[PDB]
CSV table of C-alpha atoms and ligand atoms in Angstrom, one decimal:
chain,number,residue,atom,x,y,z
A,4,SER,CA,95.8,97.2,123.6
A,5,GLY,CA,96.7,94.1,121.6
A,6,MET,CA,99.7,95.8,120.0
A,7,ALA,CA,103.1,94.3,120.0
A,8,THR,CA,105.6,95.9,122.3
A,9,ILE,CA,109.3,95.4,122.8
A,10,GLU,CA,108.3,93.4,125.8
A,11,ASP,CA,105.9,91.2,123.9
A,12,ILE,CA,108.7,90.5,121.5
A,13,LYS,CA,111.1,89.7,124.3
A,14,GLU,CA,108.6,87.5,126.2
A,15,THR,CA,106.9,85.7,123.3
A,16,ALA,CA,110.1,84.9,121.3
A,17,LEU,CA,113.3,85.5,123.0
A,18,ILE,CA,112.9,83.9,126.5
A,19,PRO,CA,113.9,80.4,125.6
A,20,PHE,CA,117.4,81.3,124.2
A,21,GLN,CA,119.0,83.5,126.9
A,22,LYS,CA,121.3,80.6,127.5
A,23,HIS,CA,123.8,81.3,124.7
A,24,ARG,CA,125.2,84.2,122.7
A,25,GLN,CA,125.3,82.0,119.6
A,26,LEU,CA,122.0,80.7,118.1
A,27,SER,CA,121.6,77.7,115.9
A,28,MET,CA,120.0,78.1,112.4
A,29,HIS,CA,116.9,76.4,113.7
A,30,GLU,CA,116.7,78.7,116.8
A,31,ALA,CA,116.9,81.8,114.7
A,32,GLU,CA,114.1,80.3,112.6
A,33,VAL,CA,111.9,79.7,115.7
A,34,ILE,CA,112.6,83.2,116.9
A,35,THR,CA,111.7,84.5,113.4
A,36,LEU,CA,108.3,82.9,113.0
A,37,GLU,CA,107.5,83.9,116.6
A,38,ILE,CA,107.9,87.6,115.8
A,39,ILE,CA,106.0,87.3,112.6
A,40,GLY,CA,103.4,85.4,114.5
A,41,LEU,CA,103.1,88.4,116.6
A,42,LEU,CA,103.0,91.0,113.8
A,43,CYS,CA,101.0,89.2,111.2
A,44,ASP,CA,97.5,90.1,112.4
A,45,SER,CA,98.3,92.9,114.8
A,46,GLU,CA,100.5,96.0,114.7
A,47,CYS,CA,103.5,97.5,116.4
A,48,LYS,CA,102.6,99.7,119.4
A,49,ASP,CA,105.1,102.3,118.2
A,50,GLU,CA,108.2,103.4,116.3
A,51,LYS,CA,110.5,102.1,119.0
A,52,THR,CA,109.2,98.6,118.6
A,53,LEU,CA,109.4,98.7,114.8
A,54,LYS,CA,112.9,100.1,115.1
A,55,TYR,CA,113.9,97.6,117.8
A,56,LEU,CA,112.6,94.8,115.5
A,57,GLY,CA,115.1,95.5,112.8
A,58,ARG,CA,117.8,93.5,114.7
A,59,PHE,CA,115.9,90.3,113.8
A,60,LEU,CA,114.9,90.8,110.2
A,61,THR,CA,116.4,90.7,106.8
A,62,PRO,CA,114.9,92.5,103.8
A,63,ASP,CA,113.6,89.1,102.6
A,64,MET,CA,112.0,88.2,105.9
A,65,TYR,CA,110.3,91.6,106.0
A,66,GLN,CA,109.0,90.9,102.6
A,67,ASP,CA,107.4,87.7,103.9
A,68,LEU,CA,105.9,89.6,106.8
A,69,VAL,CA,104.3,92.1,104.4
A,70,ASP,CA,102.9,89.3,102.4
A,71,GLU,CA,101.5,87.5,105.4
A,72,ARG,CA,100.0,90.8,106.7
A,73,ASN,CA,98.3,91.3,103.3
A,74,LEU,CA,97.0,87.8,103.5
A,75,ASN,CA,95.4,88.7,106.9
A,76,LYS,CA,94.0,91.7,105.1
A,77,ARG,CA,96.3,94.3,106.7
A,78,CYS,CA,98.5,97.1,105.4
A,79,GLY,CA,102.0,95.9,104.8
A,80,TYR,CA,103.6,98.4,107.2
A,81,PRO,CA,103.7,96.9,110.7
A,82,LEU,CA,102.5,100.2,112.4
A,83,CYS,CA,99.3,100.3,110.4
A,84,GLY,CA,96.1,98.6,111.4
A,85,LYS,CA,94.2,99.5,108.2
A,86,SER,CA,93.8,97.1,105.3
A,87,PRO,CA,95.3,97.5,101.8
A,88,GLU,CA,93.3,99.9,99.5
A,89,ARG,CA,92.8,97.3,96.7
A,90,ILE,CA,92.5,93.5,97.2
A,91,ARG,CA,94.5,91.0,95.2
A,92,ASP,CA,94.3,87.3,94.5
A,93,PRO,CA,97.7,85.7,95.3
A,94,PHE,CA,97.0,83.0,92.7
A,95,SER,CA,95.8,85.4,90.0
A,96,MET,CA,98.2,86.0,87.1
A,97,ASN,CA,96.0,89.0,86.0
A,98,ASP,CA,96.6,90.6,89.4
A,99,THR,CA,100.3,89.7,89.1
A,100,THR,CA,100.4,91.1,85.6
A,101,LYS,CA,98.7,94.4,86.6
A,102,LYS,CA,101.4,95.3,89.1
A,103,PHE,CA,104.0,95.4,86.3
A,104,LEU,CA,102.1,96.0,83.1
A,105,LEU,CA,100.3,99.1,84.3
A,106,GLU,CA,102.9,101.9,84.2
A,107,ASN,CA,102.9,104.2,87.2
A,108,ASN,CA,99.5,103.0,88.4
A,109,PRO,CA,98.5,103.1,92.1
A,110,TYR,CA,97.5,99.4,91.9
A,111,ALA,CA,101.0,98.2,92.4
A,112,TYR,CA,101.2,99.7,95.9
A,113,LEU,CA,97.6,100.2,96.9
A,114,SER,CA,97.2,96.4,96.6
A,115,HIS,CA,99.9,96.0,99.4
A,116,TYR,CA,99.3,99.1,101.6
A,117,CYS,CA,96.6,101.5,102.7
A,118,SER,CA,98.4,104.3,100.9
A,119,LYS,CA,101.5,105.4,99.0
A,120,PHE,CA,102.7,107.0,102.2
A,121,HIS,CA,102.8,103.7,104.0
A,122,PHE,CA,104.3,102.0,100.9
A,123,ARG,CA,107.1,104.4,101.3
A,124,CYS,CA,107.5,104.0,105.0
A,125,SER,CA,107.6,100.2,104.6
A,126,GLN,CA,110.2,100.3,101.8
A,127,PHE,CA,112.4,103.0,103.4
A,128,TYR,CA,112.5,100.7,106.4
A,129,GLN,CA,113.1,97.5,104.5
A,130,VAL,CA,116.1,98.6,102.4
A,131,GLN,CA,118.0,99.4,105.6
A,132,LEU,CA,117.7,95.9,106.9
A,133,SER,CA,120.8,93.7,106.9
A,134,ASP,CA,121.1,90.7,104.6
A,135,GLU,CA,123.0,88.9,107.4
A,136,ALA,CA,121.0,85.9,108.7
A,137,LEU,CA,119.7,86.3,112.2
A,138,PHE,CA,121.6,83.3,113.7
A,139,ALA,CA,124.8,85.0,112.4
A,140,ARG,CA,123.9,88.1,114.5
A,141,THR,CA,125.4,86.7,117.7
A,142,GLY,CA,123.9,88.1,120.9
A,143,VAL,CA,121.2,90.4,119.3
A,144,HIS,CA,118.5,88.4,121.1
A,145,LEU,CA,120.0,88.7,124.6
A,146,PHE,CA,118.1,90.8,127.2
A,147,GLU,CA,121.1,91.9,129.1
A,148,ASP,CA,123.3,92.2,126.0
A,149,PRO,CA,127.0,92.7,126.8
A,150,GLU,CA,127.1,94.4,123.3
A,151,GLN,CA,123.7,96.1,123.5
A,152,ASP,CA,125.1,99.5,122.7
A,153,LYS,CA,126.9,97.9,119.7
A,154,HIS,CA,123.9,96.1,118.3
A,155,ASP,CA,121.8,99.3,118.8
A,156,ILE,CA,124.2,100.9,116.3
A,157,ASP,CA,124.8,98.0,114.0
A,158,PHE,CA,121.1,97.5,113.5
A,159,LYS,CA,120.0,101.1,113.7
A,160,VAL,CA,117.0,101.7,111.5
A,161,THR,CA,115.7,105.2,110.7
A,162,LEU,CA,112.0,105.5,110.0
A,163,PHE,CA,110.8,107.5,107.0
A,164,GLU,CA,108.6,109.5,109.2
A,165,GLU,CA,111.5,110.4,111.5
A,166,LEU,CA,113.1,112.2,108.5
A,167,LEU,CA,109.9,114.0,107.6
A,168,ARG,CA,109.5,115.3,111.1
A,169,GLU,CA,113.1,116.4,111.4
A,170,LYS,CA,112.8,118.9,108.6
A,171,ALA,CA,109.5,120.8,109.5
A,172,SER,CA,109.8,124.6,109.7
A,173,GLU,CA,109.0,126.9,112.6
A,174,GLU,CA,105.8,128.0,110.9
A,175,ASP,CA,104.9,124.3,110.5
A,176,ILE,CA,105.9,123.5,114.1
A,177,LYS,CA,103.9,126.5,115.5
A,178,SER,CA,100.6,125.4,113.9
A,179,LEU,CA,100.4,122.3,116.1
A,180,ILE,CA,100.5,124.3,119.4
A,181,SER,CA,98.1,127.2,118.5
B,201,ZN,ZN1,98.7,101.7,106.3
C-alpha cells in the first residue's frame, strides 16, 4: 500500500538500537530522520500508527515534519495524502507576510493543509507531544519494552477525530447503518 505502518517504523528505524535502553543524542537523531524519511512523502496507514509515533516526536520535530511534507507538496497531517489547498513559496516574504497580516483568512492554514479540518487534527495532535528529547525517553524504542505499558501511557496521544467520534448521538450513529 506504500503507507507507513508501526512495523515499517520498527523495521526501518528502530532495528539497529535494540541493544540498549539508553540512546545517544546522535542515535535519537538517526532514529528521528529515519521516521521523517518514512512520513515525508507518504502517509500513515492509520490512527494507531500516528498515535504510536508520538513516542518519538517533540512538538518541534512534528513542525519540521509538517514543513517537509508541504515541501513534498503534501497536507501537513501525516494521515492525509492530499496536497495543501494553496501553494506557498518558502523564500517569499509576501507569502510569509500573508499568513500574519491577513486577519482570520484561510490562507494561513490552507497553505499548510488540505483543509481547516486537517489543520485542527494536526495541531490537536502536536500540542500533546512532549518537549522531552527522544534520547531522554529511555526505552521507548525497544520492541520488547519492559516498560511498554508505561510508555503507552506516558506518550498517549488522543486524536482530534477520536473526540469527534466519541460524542455522536444515536440519531447520528443510526444513519450509518441504515
Ligand atoms: Zn489533508
